[PDB]
Amino acid sequence: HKHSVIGVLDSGVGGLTVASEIIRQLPKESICYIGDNERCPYGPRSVEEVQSFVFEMVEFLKQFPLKALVVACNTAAAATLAALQEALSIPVIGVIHPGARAAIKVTKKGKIGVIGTVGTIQSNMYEKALHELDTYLKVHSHACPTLATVVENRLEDTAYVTQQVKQALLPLTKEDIDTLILGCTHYPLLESYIKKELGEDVTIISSAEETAIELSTILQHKGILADNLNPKHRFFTTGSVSSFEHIAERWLGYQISVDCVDLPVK
Amino acid sequence: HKHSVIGVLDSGVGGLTVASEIIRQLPKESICYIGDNERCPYGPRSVEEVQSFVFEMVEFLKQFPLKALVVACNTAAAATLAALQEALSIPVIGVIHPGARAAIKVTKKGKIGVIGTVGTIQSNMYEKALHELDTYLKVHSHACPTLATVVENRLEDTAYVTQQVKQALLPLTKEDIDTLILGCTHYPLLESYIKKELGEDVTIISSAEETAIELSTILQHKGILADNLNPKHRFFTTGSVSSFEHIAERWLGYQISVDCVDLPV
Ligand SMILES: N[C@H](CCC(=O)O)C(=O)O
Ligand SMILES: N[C@H](CCC(=O)O)C(=O)O
Ligand SMILES: [K+]
Ligand SMILES: [K+]
């Protein structure tokens, strides 16, 4: 396992929030990332379709020596995490359960909100994951379909972002919650807006931050942590390479290695 | 219908902070706790002695159907975690690694402080654990030998507690850290005093809170979570039963089931 990498898959660029947290909290691990930008968004797609696309990305990642797989996309995790964990022998870490687990840790009232794409919310995976750990939690799940697009295409228009965040969170402002799970790869970029809308009494949970610590926990439990003092990461996209590189530099603050890929493989 | 329990061992009553977090974050799991109050404290004891006492507690807990073992005592974990993980087939979760992992998650500057007993600090297990994950972290480790006794015997004397926390943390106020790991079972009981001494720029991590989520992560990864909607927990002590019951009631806010036990079994 000394040369093995962490495979990371996502529907596009959003997953860079997850990749950044793995790079920060597990600095000796090597990332091999694939974003299916050509078919993004997955949010409005059927479960069957999303599962087929995710398995195509897994086939691509299998060309590398994987020690573990992270499904960075909440929509993809909702639709295929169980299928992947059954199919693969390596650890498969999704972004939903780590967020639910962290919500249980920070809630004082046992009342949790979660926002995400229509696919993520309709799967009801967040409520199911939360109840598996604690049946006596009240979970309010709300789809916010306009947010990911807002993050990728209108983020500089602050007035527009504020209005869209206000509209998306109106249903939750009416509910009694003290914790909110950002159940979508893109939402960390809206954290400030969200906090302003919900208030100081609601603790925000990032899927990215919690998934990296969950991965860390599992790799160490399994005794497979890397010891590389200066790893390098590789990013792949099915869409425009220049487009991905540009957003990435904006989100990360630096340039990354990006290459094109065609799915299905071979 | 899976009847296995989570074994929890500690040097005494301090481990109730860890037990309370497991009960809160994993409400379907059943706890079987043993505190070696008759030989507490472990902090000033030799590593060989602590290892021997911990293995006696494990022999006691093995009488129950254990699905996992939590070493709630930071001093005991420092001295015996490796030995336990090698000797047992069930998952053994100590309180040190979860704290280090959480510190990496919250630090922005990569400068972490940790406090604990002399035994915990002398083992240097915190620095080793932190560096295993990230070699480029600066770790400041300081023993605070008087704090656990302060928590057990002088907590109502606020002027005294403030003075003892001030003296214990003086060396860390001189260091540049943005995160502090409470590397002892008793320190959550001093969180307010510690926050006041270090300021709002230092995020304080609880070993109990992080160990419970680490346990949760591992039980679910292994597919062994309980589904019990109303479990019951049992506590055992090698010291005075009435004394344990009294402190427990003060710390938890309610009474618990406590029985006496003799080690070695
Ligand atoms: N990455 C998706 C957001 C984008 C999409 O709809 O594909 C998610 O985390 O749910
Ligand atoms: N339980 C110990 C504190 C008490 C003792 O010294 O035994 C620890 O967490 O380090
Ligand atoms: K393509
Ligand atoms: K004194």
From TrEMBL, chain A:
Class of this enzyme: isomerase
UniProt GO BP: cell wall organization; peptidoglycan biosynthetic process; regulation of cell shape
Active site residues per record: C73, C184
Annotated EC: 5.1.1.3
Pathway the protein contributes to: Cell wall biogenesis; peptidoglycan biosynthesis
Recorded GO MF terms: glutamate racemase activity; identical protein binding
Keyword ATP-binding assigned: no
Transmembrane segments: none
Pfam families hit by this protein: Asp_Glu_race
Keywords: Cell shape, Cell wall biogenesis/degradation, Isomerase, Peptidoglycan synthesis
Keyword Metal-binding carried by entry: no
Catalytic activity entry: L-glutamate = D-glutamate
Binding-site positions, substrate: D10, S11, Y42, G43, N74, T75, T185, H186
Lineage: superkingdom: Bacteria
Family statement: Belongs to the aspartate/glutamate racemases family.
The protein's role, per its UniProt record: Provides the (R)-glutamate required for cell wall biosynthesis.
Protein name: Glutamate racemase
Protein's organism: Bacillus anthracis
